[PDB]
Symmetry: C5
Subunit: 202 residues, 5 copies
């Protein structure tokens, strides 16, 4: 005996575990906020102050283009969005299936969206290992200090100096630690919400 803004929050809370909620808080307060606020200013002058020891115009542009085919700030952003996509698709599905069932009508009788949670957890877990492997195989662990350049529109070999590599290496380690910690939180929910299912099935 509740209103429509009643049994529309219980039907979404009772189908998600506390571990998932705290994972959501951790993944949106320590990952999607640090990247936007403290990641953009750091990588604002990666090309402006990429000083190369040369004088022929155009050597610096190609040298920088060869040095970094794609900066890892965009890699972090893409990985963060692709991790959060399944957590939104499932929420939309739950809302659609919960707000349409009350229209027909008949101490609560909330639906049971449990079979749609394990698949979501599996997809989210699988989407992180591939991204971690790509991160390791593309960017390594720490940024380099100087780069040698040989692609000639210019004459010779030009050694260029990277800008503020220590802070970049610190931020990379921080994000690595955050992702590693968040992987275990999502792995512990799949092994706990699946052993709690076969128990309640005589």
């Amino acid at each position: 005996g509740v209103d429509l803004l009643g049994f529309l929050i219980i039907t979404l809370n009772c189908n998600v575990t506390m571990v998932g909620k705290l994972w959501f808080v951790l993944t949106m307060l320590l990952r999607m906020l640090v990247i936007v606020l403290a990641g953009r200013p750091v990588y604002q002058d990666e090309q402006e102050r990429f000083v190369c020891n040369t004088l022929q115009p155009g050597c610096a542009n190609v040298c920088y283009d060869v040095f970094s085919p794609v900066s890892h700030l965009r890699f972090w952003l893409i990985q963060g969005v692709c991790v959060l996509l399944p957590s939104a698709v499932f929420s939309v599905y739950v809302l659609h299936r919960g707000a349409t069932l009350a229209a027909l009508g008949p101490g609560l009788q909330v639906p049971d969206f449990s079979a749609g949670y394990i698949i979501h957890l599996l997809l989210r877990t699988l989407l992180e290992a591939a991204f971690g492997a790509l991160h390791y195989f593309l960017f390594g662990f720490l940024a380099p200090k100087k780069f040698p350049c040989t692609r000639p529109p210019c004459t010779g070999v030009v050694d260029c100096y990277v800008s503020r590599p220590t802070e970049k290496s610190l931020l990379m380690l921080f994000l690595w630690a955050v992702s590693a910690l968040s992987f275990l939180l999502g792995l512990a929910d799949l092994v706990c919400s699946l052993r709690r299912r076969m128990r309640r099935r005589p």
Copy 2:
């Protein structure tokens, strides 16, 4: 027997299909977020580091002005806004026609806004083909690496070097793939929500 914050969400959910909701999520989490967050920093120094091999002041300004009459970041933003406009006009219309009917008053009796959905889908689908054609005929597929300039306030032919073309070409391909995938989602909803209409009409 529901309140006003009751039969004001069902009357908006029952008139939109799950395909449309997931298209909305995809078009606002992978298109309107990537452009704002990762598109602005990339195109921040397109003119600052457009190095030209010349010394007469003023050759660089006109050469850049001839090179790019309009950058494609603004094109992407305009296309994204113009695609989402019909999806907001219909929502406003539904809210206006749903919150006014309950004022008069008489196991639910929700209205049927189905004839106003096919027209919206047709307009949204038609608004994307023209923009795709314009994108292909204006910007091509990949960015160039060097530009020749002849418009003289300066003396001769000046070859200028574009800044970070590889990352720009990667982002353009990503956005092309996203738009191509989103077109089929909007096309499959029109062919499914129209065959499901003539069935329920004896």
Copy 3:
């Protein structure tokens, strides 16, 4: 027989026409979003790359200061805010007069805020003609391509080159078209919501 979050949306929806709602959508999705997102990056380097053919320090600063006493981005922002102010004052007034009347108490009995709509429409319409006239008399229709400078801390006449004038001229024409189209929407509501009033008064 509704709650307080009941007859507090009808009392605000029944007093505003569909034309006004779609005008609100149009002038907040195509005017206040384009200016913020695509207007700031364009006018970010108007002074940084205002190249002048001189060598005496300080000629460029005064030449730019004489060239543009006030950029038109701030003009657009001020006009946009001053247009939207009346649409918020009336909403605040309606909420204040609707949430205080239900406290006393006595198939609905919603209030009639119609006399307070024509005055709002008249003020909003009058606030746009003056701004349009100021825009035409201050900035013209197209940006110039080069500027002559004579105010001497420097020696002679210095011709400076403006940065990316074609894109600026395209954006300003787009904004002109948007404002011109929005003026007629606000003019057609005053002539329709006033002829529909004298009819219902025997």
Copy 4:
């Protein structure tokens, strides 16, 4: 006979006058939006283009540091936040005292938070005169056009040119007018909500 999302808006609306609501709208739509959106771009290159007629490195840095100990954009932001703080503390107090009283329980019986309004108005009014006096005694009314510098790491007296002083002086006058107009709105509410109190006390 209302819900909790019922007698939680009347208990906040009935304790605030229309003058206060319109002052809030004016102070958050014409003061906290202009500063953020149009104040940040103007003061973005105050140091980048502070051209000084010298050649010894380091003279420009100290000359700029002596010229502007603190820019007035931060002064405006601090004043704006410190003005709005009392208007939020009182709202939090009202919510806390209104949501806890309905738990115990017993044509409405709304509480009377009037003695807590005059003190808030007095504090808000007193917090603006001091800031106005500080603004006048620190920044004056109009920005200067050129600055003489004598603090030597360099040799001699160096005259530097300020960047775009006319637009800065226009924005300063606009903000001065806005603050002066807003002071009277807060002064007229204290003299009206206090004469309307002794009347209703036989």
Copy 5:
């Protein structure tokens, strides 16, 4: 006898004291807003205008990298996020335990989340002393005005000039004062919400 959007706000308000609410307002209106809005522009050109008295390319990059291993803006942001994390975890826990208990069902009967408040307060208080100690031992109290550099890719000892140190020193003192004031607010809530607990236990 309330709805679900009823006994879901009382169960969260009655478990938090007014001191905590005003601390939240203070630590989100004077700490998380000043840093984002007035902290980013100040530290935007810390490396761009770090002038060094040398001519060999690459000396400036390493000199700046040695001078500031990590800027204190990121330190402030990390400390602010880590302070607010416990205040969000507890809120999520309260919502989860309050929205699930009403599903089963049985002048109010709100739960008592008091034992879960002292632990949260203790963790939040302990998380600030360590950060304050780190701030003192890493950045001191005032920024320096000039830096000597000896790490050679360059020849000799190079004295570089910091950019706008006075404003940085003023902002750092302001943030120090804000943090010091906020520490006592969180300390006085633990000593008051613990003496008020043993009283109500015969």
